[PDB]
Amino acid sequence: SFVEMVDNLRGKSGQGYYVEMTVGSPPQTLNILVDTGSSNFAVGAAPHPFLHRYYQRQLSSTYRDLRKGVYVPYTQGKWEGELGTDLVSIPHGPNVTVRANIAAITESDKFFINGSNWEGILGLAYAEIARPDDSLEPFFDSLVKQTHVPNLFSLQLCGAASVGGSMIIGGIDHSLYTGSLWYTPIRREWYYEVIIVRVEINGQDLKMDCKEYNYDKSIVDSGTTNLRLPKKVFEAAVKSIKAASSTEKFPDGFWLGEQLVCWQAGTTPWNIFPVISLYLMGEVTNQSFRITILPQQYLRPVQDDCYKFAISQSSTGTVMGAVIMEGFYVVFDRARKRIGFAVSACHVHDEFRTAAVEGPFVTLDMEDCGYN
Ligand SMILES: CC(C)CNC(=O)[C@@H](NC[C@@H](O)[C@H](Cc1ccccc1)NC(=O)c1cc(C(=O)N[C@H](C)c2ccccc2)cc(N(C)S(C)(=O)=O)c1)[C@H](C)O
């Protein structure tokens, strides 16, 4: 069942995790970026400098035009295209074929990435944020109503120059994580929004108003590279990581992601970089759990060893991107309106520290952490 889906994700470092899919009749094989931070299924349908191949509706026996246009803007990049429907299949997924909506991308800007090796995007979030509007069915909703595939999927993103991982569609593969799964409620169903109730850095409470962490939302977004934080939080955090690593000095544009930093290979001072603990709302009253991330997650690798600072500011709330998701087995349990976290089988090691998921913790007034 699920062993066929283990390792069905590929990618280049810093360029995104994709899965193999086929569209149309006869089947057109395509690499599709897996994005929990959006809800449209789209593929390049026109020649592009960065695209090795693209979707051809002309050669599809099954393609149906919807004669509606569509435009989709992300934080990074944008595109427009022609809405249609076609048969879609997942080679290393469940043994099924569904008719799903597909946006055929004819125009785009700063969206496709050179060398990334993917030609499309699979938005796995809810209809509420689908473009043009919620009447356009997202892929996973189509898959669930048309088949007996359970309303659940898991993502295990394995970090660094080739990355890989697993998208378990329809279930939970217990050989891919250690310890117990801890679950946080999905607050409402648009993005996969969660509520962060406490933040620690090297075991010291950031001591911020709970609400600041979730202003105006906090989402789990596999389509985003970084851990993005609200301005006030981000400044609090950076001040703390600086002070921890003040033993060395970096140009200020490093903390902005504008510049790299290098160390002679094998001498990277991981110790002076702190661990970050995010506390998430739990399932029972006054109960939370924490996930802890190593500097090996937010110092992304680019003779020597060079790194980019992968914590950034945001004006759309906290975005728990690949930085957080790598090294965790993440269960998007839509059926039970919850997201599970567990230490990944491909958690990446520190000599004297480890990524963790721990509970139970007690946290009072967790509902006050939510922003309205
Ligand atoms: C459709 C609507 C619901 C709009 N939704 C959204 O805007 C929300 N989520 C965004 C994602 O949907 C989209 C989908 C996408 C876009 C472009 C290329 C590939 C994939 N992603 C991004 O905007 C995005 C991408 C990157 C980035 O570089 N990604 C590469 C592919 C990657 C590398 C490694 C791991 C994962 C992804 C960065 C960023 N950053 C801003 S950063 C430098 O990490 O701080 C943002 C947003 C966070 O609020």
Coordinates of C-alpha atoms and ligand atoms in Angstrom, one line a residue:
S1 CA 0.0 0.0 0.0
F2 CA 2.1 2.9 1.3
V3 CA 5.6 1.4 0.5
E4 CA 4.9 2.3 -3.1
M5 CA 4.7 6.0 -2.1
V6 CA 7.7 6.2 0.1
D7 CA 10.4 8.4 -1.6
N8 CA 8.0 9.6 -4.3
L9 CA 9.2 13.2 -3.8
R10 CA 12.3 14.7 -5.4
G11 CA 13.9 18.2 -5.7
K12 CA 17.0 20.3 -5.8
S13 CA 18.1 22.1 -2.6
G14 CA 16.2 25.3 -2.1
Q15 CA 14.1 24.8 -5.2
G16 CA 11.1 22.8 -3.9
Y17 CA 9.7 19.3 -3.5
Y18 CA 7.8 17.8 -6.4
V19 CA 5.8 14.6 -7.2
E20 CA 5.3 12.8 -10.5
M21 CA 1.9 13.1 -12.0
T22 CA 0.3 12.4 -15.4
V23 CA -2.4 14.5 -17.1
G24 CA -4.6 13.9 -20.2
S25 CA -5.1 11.0 -22.5
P26 CA -2.6 9.8 -23.6
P27 CA -0.8 10.4 -20.2
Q28 CA 1.6 13.3 -20.1
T29 CA 4.2 12.8 -17.3
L30 CA 5.0 16.0 -15.3
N31 CA 6.8 17.0 -12.1
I32 CA 4.5 19.0 -9.9
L33 CA 5.5 21.0 -6.9
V34 CA 3.7 20.1 -3.7
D35 CA 2.2 23.1 -2.0
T36 CA 0.1 23.1 1.1
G37 CA 0.0 26.9 1.0
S38 CA -2.3 27.2 -1.9
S39 CA -5.3 25.5 -3.5
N40 CA -5.0 25.6 -7.3
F41 CA -3.7 22.8 -9.5
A42 CA -1.7 24.4 -12.4
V43 CA 0.9 23.4 -14.9
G44 CA 3.0 25.3 -17.6
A45 CA 1.1 25.0 -20.9
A46 CA 3.4 27.2 -23.0
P47 CA 7.1 27.3 -23.7
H48 CA 9.2 28.9 -21.0
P49 CA 13.0 29.4 -20.6
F50 CA 13.0 27.4 -17.4
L51 CA 10.6 24.6 -18.5
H52 CA 12.0 21.4 -19.9
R53 CA 8.6 20.3 -20.9
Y54 CA 4.9 21.4 -20.6
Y55 CA 1.3 20.4 -20.8
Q56 CA -0.2 20.2 -24.3
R57 CA -4.0 20.3 -24.1
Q58 CA -4.1 19.7 -27.9
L59 CA -2.7 16.1 -27.5
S60 CA -5.2 15.2 -24.8
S61 CA -8.2 13.1 -25.7
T62 CA -9.7 14.0 -22.3
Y63 CA -9.1 17.8 -22.0
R64 CA -12.2 20.0 -21.6
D65 CA -11.9 23.8 -21.7
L66 CA -13.9 25.8 -19.2
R67 CA -13.5 29.1 -21.1
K68 CA -12.7 30.9 -17.8
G69 CA -9.4 32.6 -17.3
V70 CA -7.7 32.6 -14.0
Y71 CA -4.9 34.6 -12.3
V72 CA -3.0 33.4 -9.2
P73 CA -0.7 35.6 -7.1
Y74 CA 1.7 34.2 -4.4
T75 CA 4.1 36.0 -2.0
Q76 CA 6.7 35.0 -4.6
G77 CA 5.7 34.9 -8.2
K78 CA 2.4 35.0 -10.2
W79 CA 0.8 33.5 -13.3
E80 CA -2.4 33.3 -15.3
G81 CA -3.9 30.6 -17.5
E82 CA -6.9 28.8 -18.8
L83 CA -9.1 26.7 -16.5
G84 CA -10.0 23.3 -17.8
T85 CA -10.6 19.8 -16.6
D86 CA -8.7 16.6 -17.5
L87 CA -7.9 13.1 -16.2
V88 CA -5.0 13.1 -13.7
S89 CA -3.1 10.2 -12.2
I90 CA -0.3 9.8 -9.7
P91 CA 2.3 7.1 -10.7
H92 CA 3.7 6.6 -7.2
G93 CA 0.5 7.4 -5.4
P94 CA -2.8 5.5 -5.1
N95 CA -4.0 3.4 -8.0
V96 CA -6.6 5.9 -9.2
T97 CA -7.6 8.3 -11.9
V98 CA -9.6 11.4 -11.3
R99 CA -11.1 14.2 -13.3
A100 CA -9.7 17.4 -11.8
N101 CA -9.6 21.1 -12.5
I102 CA -6.3 22.2 -14.1
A103 CA -5.0 25.7 -14.8
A104 CA -3.0 25.8 -18.0
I105 CA -0.3 28.4 -17.4
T106 CA 0.3 30.6 -20.5
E107 CA 1.9 33.5 -18.7
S108 CA 4.0 33.8 -15.5
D109 CA 6.4 36.1 -13.6
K110 CA 9.1 35.0 -11.1
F111 CA 7.2 31.7 -10.5
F112 CA 9.1 29.0 -12.4
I113 CA 12.6 28.4 -11.1
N114 CA 15.6 27.6 -13.3
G115 CA 16.9 24.0 -12.8
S116 CA 14.1 23.3 -10.2
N117 CA 12.9 20.5 -12.5
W118 CA 9.2 21.0 -11.8
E119 CA 6.6 22.3 -14.3
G120 CA 3.5 22.6 -12.2
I121 CA 2.1 23.2 -8.7
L122 CA -0.3 21.1 -6.6
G123 CA -2.1 23.3 -4.2
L124 CA -3.3 21.1 -1.4
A125 CA -5.1 23.6 0.8
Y126 CA -8.9 24.2 0.9
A127 CA -11.3 25.6 -1.6
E128 CA -11.8 28.8 0.4
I129 CA -8.5 30.3 -1.0
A130 CA -8.8 28.8 -4.5
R131 CA -8.7 31.2 -7.4
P132 CA -11.0 32.6 -8.9
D133 CA -13.2 31.5 -6.0
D134 CA -14.2 28.5 -3.9
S135 CA -16.4 27.0 -6.6
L136 CA -13.2 25.8 -8.3
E137 CA -12.6 22.3 -6.7
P138 CA -9.0 21.8 -5.5
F139 CA -7.4 18.5 -6.6
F140 CA -7.5 16.7 -3.3
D141 CA -11.2 17.3 -2.9
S142 CA -11.7 15.8 -6.3
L143 CA -9.6 12.8 -5.5
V144 CA -11.5 12.1 -2.3
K145 CA -15.1 12.5 -3.7
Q146 CA -14.2 10.4 -6.8
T147 CA -12.4 7.6 -5.0
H148 CA -12.3 5.8 -1.7
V149 CA -8.9 7.4 -0.8
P150 CA -9.2 8.6 2.9
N151 CA -9.3 12.3 3.5
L152 CA -5.7 12.5 4.8
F153 CA -2.2 12.9 3.5
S154 CA 1.3 13.1 5.0
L155 CA 4.4 15.0 4.0
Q156 CA 7.9 14.0 5.0
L157 CA 10.4 16.5 3.5
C158 CA 14.0 15.4 3.7
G159 CA 16.5 18.2 3.5
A160 CA 20.1 18.4 2.1
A161 CA 22.5 18.7 -3.5
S162 CA 19.4 16.6 -4.2
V163 CA 16.5 16.4 -1.7
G164 CA 13.7 13.9 -1.5
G165 CA 10.9 12.7 0.8
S166 CA 7.5 11.2 0.9
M167 CA 3.9 12.2 0.2
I168 CA 1.8 9.4 1.7
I169 CA -1.6 9.9 0.1
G170 CA -4.5 8.5 2.1
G171 CA -2.8 7.5 5.3
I172 CA 0.0 7.3 7.8
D173 CA 3.2 5.3 7.2
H174 CA 4.6 4.4 10.7
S175 CA 8.1 3.5 9.4
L176 CA 8.7 7.1 8.5
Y177 CA 8.7 8.6 12.0
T178 CA 9.9 7.9 15.5
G179 CA 8.1 8.6 18.8
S180 CA 4.5 9.8 19.1
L181 CA 2.5 12.0 16.7
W182 CA 1.3 15.2 18.4
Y183 CA -1.7 17.0 16.9
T184 CA -2.7 20.6 16.6
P185 CA -6.2 21.7 15.5
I186 CA -6.8 23.3 12.1
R187 CA -8.5 26.5 13.3
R188 CA -10.8 26.9 10.3
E189 CA -10.4 25.5 6.7
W190 CA -8.7 27.8 4.2
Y191 CA -4.9 27.7 4.6
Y192 CA -3.8 25.0 7.0
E193 CA -3.9 27.5 9.9
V194 CA -2.7 26.6 13.4
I195 CA -2.2 28.5 16.6
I196 CA 1.2 29.1 18.1
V197 CA 1.0 29.6 21.9
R198 CA 4.6 30.0 23.0
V199 CA 8.1 30.5 21.5
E200 CA 11.4 29.6 23.0
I201 CA 15.0 30.2 21.8
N202 CA 17.7 28.1 23.5
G203 CA 15.1 27.4 26.1
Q204 CA 14.3 31.0 26.9
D205 CA 10.7 32.3 26.5
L206 CA 10.5 35.0 23.9
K207 CA 8.0 36.6 26.3
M208 CA 5.7 38.1 23.7
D209 CA 2.0 38.6 23.7
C210 CA 0.6 35.3 22.4
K211 CA -1.3 37.1 19.7
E212 CA 1.8 38.4 18.1
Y213 CA 2.9 35.0 16.9
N214 CA -0.4 34.5 15.0
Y215 CA -0.9 38.0 13.5
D216 CA -2.7 37.8 11.3
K217 CA -2.4 34.0 10.9
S218 CA 0.0 31.1 11.2
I219 CA 0.1 28.5 8.4
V220 CA 1.8 25.3 7.5
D221 CA 3.1 25.9 4.0
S222 CA 5.3 23.4 2.1
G223 CA 5.4 25.8 -0.9
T224 CA 7.4 28.3 1.1
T225 CA 11.1 27.9 1.8
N226 CA 11.5 29.9 5.0
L227 CA 10.2 30.3 8.5
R228 CA 8.5 33.7 8.0
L229 CA 7.5 35.7 11.1
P230 CA 5.6 38.9 11.7
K231 CA 7.8 42.0 12.0
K232 CA 7.6 42.3 15.8
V233 CA 8.3 38.6 16.3
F234 CA 11.0 38.4 13.7
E235 CA 12.9 41.3 15.3
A236 CA 12.6 39.7 18.7
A237 CA 13.9 36.4 17.2
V238 CA 16.8 37.9 15.2
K239 CA 18.0 40.0 18.2
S240 CA 18.1 36.6 20.1
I241 CA 20.0 34.7 17.4
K242 CA 22.5 37.5 17.0
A243 CA 23.2 37.7 20.7
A244 CA 23.7 33.9 20.8
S245 CA 26.2 33.9 18.0
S246 CA 27.7 37.3 18.7
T247 CA 31.0 35.4 19.2
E248 CA 31.3 35.8 15.4
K249 CA 30.2 38.6 13.2
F250 CA 28.2 38.6 10.0
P251 CA 27.3 41.5 7.7
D252 CA 23.8 42.8 8.6
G253 CA 22.5 41.9 5.1
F254 CA 23.0 38.2 6.1
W255 CA 20.2 38.5 8.7
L256 CA 18.1 39.7 5.7
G257 CA 19.0 36.8 3.5
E258 CA 20.8 39.2 1.1
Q259 CA 24.2 37.8 1.7
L260 CA 25.8 34.4 2.5
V261 CA 28.3 33.4 5.1
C262 CA 31.0 30.8 4.7
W263 CA 33.2 28.7 6.9
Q264 CA 36.1 26.3 5.9
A265 CA 34.4 23.0 5.2
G266 CA 33.7 21.0 8.4
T267 CA 34.1 23.9 10.8
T268 CA 30.7 25.4 10.8
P269 CA 30.1 26.7 14.4
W270 CA 26.6 25.1 14.9
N271 CA 26.9 25.5 18.7
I272 CA 26.7 29.3 18.7
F273 CA 23.4 29.0 16.9
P274 CA 20.3 28.4 19.1
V275 CA 17.5 25.9 18.8
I276 CA 14.0 27.3 18.3
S277 CA 10.9 25.9 20.0
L278 CA 7.4 26.5 18.7
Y279 CA 4.6 25.6 21.0
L280 CA 1.4 24.5 19.2
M281 CA -2.2 24.3 20.6
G282 CA -2.9 20.7 21.6
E283 CA -6.1 18.6 21.5
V284 CA -7.2 18.6 25.1
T285 CA -7.9 21.5 27.5
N286 CA -4.9 23.7 28.5
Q287 CA -2.6 21.3 26.7
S288 CA 0.1 22.1 24.1
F289 CA 3.2 20.5 22.7
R290 CA 6.4 21.9 21.3
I291 CA 8.4 21.2 18.1
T292 CA 12.1 22.1 18.3
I293 CA 14.2 23.0 15.2
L294 CA 18.0 23.0 14.8
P295 CA 20.1 25.7 13.2
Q296 CA 20.7 23.1 10.5
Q297 CA 17.2 23.9 9.4
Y298 CA 17.2 27.7 9.2
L299 CA 20.8 28.0 8.0
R300 CA 20.3 26.7 4.5
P301 CA 23.3 25.3 2.5
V302 CA 24.2 27.1 -0.7
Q303 CA 36.1 24.4 -1.0
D304 CA 34.0 25.9 1.9
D305 CA 30.6 25.6 3.4
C306 CA 28.2 28.5 2.7
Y307 CA 24.8 29.3 4.2
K308 CA 21.7 31.5 3.9
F309 CA 19.7 32.8 6.8
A310 CA 16.3 31.2 6.2
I311 CA 14.2 33.2 8.7
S312 CA 12.4 36.2 7.1
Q313 CA 9.8 38.8 8.0
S314 CA 6.2 38.6 6.9
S315 CA 3.1 40.8 6.8
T316 CA 0.8 37.9 6.3
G317 CA 1.5 36.1 9.6
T318 CA 3.7 33.2 10.5
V319 CA 4.5 30.9 7.6
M320 CA 5.8 27.5 8.7
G321 CA 7.7 26.5 5.6
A322 CA 10.2 23.8 4.6
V323 CA 12.6 25.1 7.2
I324 CA 10.2 23.9 9.9
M325 CA 8.7 20.9 7.9
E326 CA 12.1 19.3 7.0
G327 CA 12.9 16.7 9.7
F328 CA 9.3 16.3 10.7
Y329 CA 6.7 13.8 9.6
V330 CA 3.7 16.0 9.1
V331 CA 0.2 14.6 8.9
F332 CA -2.5 16.7 7.3
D333 CA -5.5 15.0 8.9
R334 CA -8.3 16.9 7.1
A335 CA -10.9 14.3 8.2
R336 CA -10.3 15.2 11.8
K337 CA -9.4 18.9 11.2
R338 CA -5.9 18.5 12.7
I339 CA -2.2 18.4 11.8
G340 CA 0.2 15.9 13.4
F341 CA 3.9 16.4 14.0
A342 CA 6.5 13.7 14.7
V343 CA 10.3 13.5 14.4
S344 CA 11.1 12.4 10.9
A345 CA 13.1 9.3 10.0
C346 CA 15.2 11.7 8.0
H347 CA 15.7 14.3 10.8
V348 CA 19.1 15.8 10.2
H349 CA 21.7 15.4 13.0
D350 CA 23.6 17.7 15.3
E351 CA 26.4 16.3 17.4
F352 CA 24.9 17.2 20.8
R353 CA 21.4 18.3 19.9
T354 CA 18.3 16.9 18.2
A355 CA 15.1 18.1 16.5
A356 CA 12.1 17.1 18.7
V357 CA 8.4 16.8 19.3
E358 CA 7.5 16.8 22.9
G359 CA 4.4 16.9 25.2
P360 CA 2.3 17.3 27.0
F361 CA 2.8 20.9 28.1
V362 CA 0.3 23.0 30.0
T363 CA -0.6 26.3 28.5
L364 CA -3.4 28.6 29.9
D365 CA -5.6 30.8 27.7
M366 CA -4.5 29.2 24.4
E367 CA -7.6 30.6 22.6
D368 CA -6.4 34.1 23.3
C369 CA -3.4 33.4 21.1
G370 CA -5.6 33.4 18.1
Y371 CA -5.9 36.6 16.2
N372 CA -9.3 38.0 15.1
Ligands
LIG1 C1 -2.7 31.0 -4.0 C2 -2.9 31.9 -2.8 C3 -3.6 31.0 -1.7 C4 -1.6 32.5 -2.2 N1 -1.0 31.8 -1.1 C5 0.2 32.3 -0.5 O1 0.7 33.3 -0.9 C6 0.9 31.6 0.7 N2 1.7 30.4 0.5 C7 2.6 30.6 -0.7 C8 2.8 29.3 -1.7 O2 1.5 29.0 -2.1 C9 3.6 29.7 -2.9 C10 3.7 28.6 -4.0 C11 4.9 28.7 -4.9 C12 5.3 29.9 -5.5 C13 6.5 30.1 -6.3 C14 7.2 29.0 -6.6 C15 6.9 27.7 -6.1 C16 5.7 27.6 -5.3 N3 5.0 30.1 -2.4 C17 5.6 31.3 -2.1 O3 4.9 32.3 -2.2 C18 7.0 31.4 -1.7 C19 8.0 30.5 -2.2 C20 9.3 30.5 -1.9 C21 10.3 29.5 -2.6 O4 11.5 29.8 -2.8 N4 9.9 28.2 -2.9 C22 10.6 27.1 -3.4 C23 9.9 26.5 -4.6 C24 10.9 26.0 -2.3 C25 12.1 25.6 -2.0 C26 12.3 24.7 -0.9 C27 11.3 24.1 -0.3 C28 10.0 24.5 -0.6 C29 9.8 25.4 -1.7 C30 9.7 31.5 -1.0 C31 8.9 32.4 -0.4 N5 9.4 33.4 0.5 C32 8.7 34.7 0.7 S1 10.7 33.2 1.5 C33 12.1 33.7 0.6 O5 10.9 31.8 1.7 O6 10.6 33.9 2.6 C34 7.5 32.4 -0.8 C35 1.7 32.7 1.5 C36 2.8 32.2 2.3 O7 0.8 33.4 2.3

